[PDB]
Amino acid sequence: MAEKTVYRVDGLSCTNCAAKFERNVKEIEGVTEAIVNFGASKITVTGEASIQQVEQAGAFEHLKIIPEKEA
């Protein structure tokens, strides 16, 4: 009852690449929204999908994204 998540991402540092990313996410039919910061931050995904799909997309620059966990 929320179906939104954010994962921590590191490596790339350019708004244009962030824009490439969020659009790459939007292309996936599994997600509704995505809010992707990069630089030294995180990648929010919302809809009904997980980083994995975005991970594949991120192969354009080879990013490393980590699902945060505390438990």
Swiss-Prot record:
Belongs to the cation transport ATPase (P-type) (TC 3.A.3) family. Type IB subfamily. It comes from the Bacteria. Couples the hydrolysis of ATP with the export of cadmium. Cd(2+) binds at residues 14, 17. This is Probable cadmium-transporting ATPase. Residues 3-66 form the HMA domain. It is found in: Cell membrane. It comes from Listeria monocytogenes. Induction: By cadmium.
